[PDB]
Point group: C3
Chain length 281, copies 3
């Protein structure tokens, strides 16, 4: 898909918090297309995003971002009078920025990386009940020259669920051998977990690729993660291992048993998966 360009476009989008089946809550880019996870927000460093947000719930909701620049007005908390009342609208405003030398000669970390947004005022003032119900979603902020993927898949460990799904309902994601798949992995709630993928590995750093033969970042297939931790990577599907149904799961042993498990379906060029007996789950 090429590579990211340099940023600096004032983007704007519409966001709504809606009720979902089963008492669940979610964000969507249009009324009635709310999902869990929320819609993937993607940005290039420099970009500015106005988020026009409406609350269709009977309770106040908010919209709070990790890792992006925001004045306190866009804090998204009761503490800075920045929530959205029932039936209310409010425009939030996020900025990103590039790395660069400061006047004291110290490097200013840019805004790039794998981030998230969630609610901060439902249930409690730290968003506990809203986060549990599914008011969360991913934010990617690229830097110029970042390799771009063929696909992007978000995997939130929210307590003992994957993306609030029922135990052992995945989700599963598909690809084809060689694809540049990207994974965003976020964690929410009470518990710590350990994210693990069969047959694939990545570098523990911003992009999940090594920069080169002098990138000392370690190569893992298992990452521990806690509430609100976010990381991402990109892998080449089946690189060095082939097609097949490739397990991902939480490696905390009671958590894969209770069903924090899903499948990375990496397919041959003809769309088949060898040995994928769908009844092996």
């Amino acid at each position: 898909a090429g590579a990211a360009p340099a940023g600096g476009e004032v983007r704007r989008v519409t966001l709504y918090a809606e009720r979902l089946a089963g008492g669940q809550l979610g964000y969507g880019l249009e009324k009635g297309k709310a999902s869990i996870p929320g819609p993937l927000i993607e940005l290039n460093e420099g970009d500015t995003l106005h988020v026009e947000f409406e609350n269709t719930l009977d309770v106040p909701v908010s919209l709070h971002v990790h890792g992006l620049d925001y004045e306190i007005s866009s804090d998204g908390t009761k503490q800075n009078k920045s929530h959205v009342e029932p039936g209310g609208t409010r425009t939030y405003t996020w900025r990103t920025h590039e790395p660069g030398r400061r006047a004291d000669g110290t490097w200013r970390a840019g805004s790039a990386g794998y981030w998230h947004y969630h609610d901060h005022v439902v249930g409690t003032e730290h968003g506990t009940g809203g986060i549990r119900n599914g008011l969360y979603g991913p934010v990617i902020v690229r830097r110029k020259g970042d390799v771009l993927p063929d696909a992007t898949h978000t995997i939130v460990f929210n307590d003992m669920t994957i993306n609030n799904r029922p135990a052992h309902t995945g989700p599963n994601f598909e690809a084809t051998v060689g694809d540049r798949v990207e994974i965003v992995m976020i964690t929410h709630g009470e518990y710590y977990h350990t994210f693990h993928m069969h047959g694939h590995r990545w570098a523990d750093n911003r992009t999940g690729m090594l920069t080169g033969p002098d990138d000392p970042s370690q190569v893992i297939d298992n990452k521990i993660c806690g509430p609100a931790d976010s990381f991402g990577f990109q892998i080449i599907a089946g690189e060095g291992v082939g097609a097949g149904a490739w397990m991902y799961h939480c490696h905390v042993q009671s958590h894969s048993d209770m069903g924090m498990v899903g499948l990375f379906l990496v397919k041959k060029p003809d769309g088949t998966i060898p040995g994928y007996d769908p009844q092996e789950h």
Copy 2:
């Protein structure tokens, strides 16, 4: 900026273990002056420090540090007769070393970082009564050319508290927009936590800040941590996000909800906090 010198002085300090109000145990720089956490001890790589310790409790205590060089005699553990009787005194010596190449020709990591000290002898032989009641403190060992801060603030997640404080008592931490703020973050006791800061982000490396455009240290705003973990960072306060009461909190949902929160009170240059009730 104005950085940290090279090291290699011999330094000396007096530290006491005391009871404070209501079952509290703590280290101080002089008597009566005990604090939780204990006093910040700061060095530059290669400095030797001679801690002249005195136990003022009616039970044994020790002084044990992370990451610095000490010889086995200054473990601060009962298991090798390093603890201190009630009323006793003992000098613990910690050393620091610069980075450098070795005998076999590999690079030997400097003793620089964000470290800590704690008791190892109260309640149990791993300091479980002593860690739980406040007998811990921060340690920073600066390299050469380390950027120096305007202020330093220690945040310790000691099981379910920040600095053995009551629930929902901060601490709160003040700065002006533009101040170079260093944060010493230590976890202790029983729970993993995940450290969070509103509006501010830092590098997951030694300094908390990147070396330049080839430093691949991840930039994060949320860090999982477990007992005896120590990291730290420098951020430019309200840089790119402005003045206001910026929350920091354990992002474990019940933990924040149960009071593991405090406010980073950041000022416009006139000493006021937009949107906050001072």
Copy 3:
């Protein structure tokens, strides 16, 4: 000294058996099983065929982290690659050197501190097979890697170190100045914080910085949860001297209840000063 560049096809026989005391483990010969299992060491490019035998009365299997295996070597009941009671199976592991793709991007190497474990006993994620000790280490070395005087594996399995009864180590001995490798794996149900007295290491691939432009953190305390694996190499007693150098999980209760051990660093004349158990 230094590790070579890989490329051999290496064969080995592997056995799952019951141990005394009702546990389970892997060995290289029959009656020689161990918890953890034996250390498997590879160079980047090395292929290893694992001639594997289930001597247990239930399906066991072998599943590896890090390495390149085809879905046929997956080790899961899910992909029908577990081994029935009494059966044999060859699991094949490959490794790859790093290198730049036609992509232009940089492909990471198989090198690392890895581990194998059972995926089919107890449950279909090997929870009962890991619990009773069916686990063990792997070190894939990159061309030129430093090689040590010793390697020791410390597995945090729930609240046991190497499935050992509480407060019984294991202790490992060394002489001042030795180069000592530690493989640290965690398994099971709990998070942990692995800590060593008197010693520190780099939080990167090898546990040692490349030099003064390696920005890696230096630590002596690392939080790890089920299936985490890492390693390092420390110079024994470096700058700190001989002694009984304690290592433990740093969750207070976990240390209190026997997740402790010792790193016994001898003076060259074999004395460990002031040590008396």
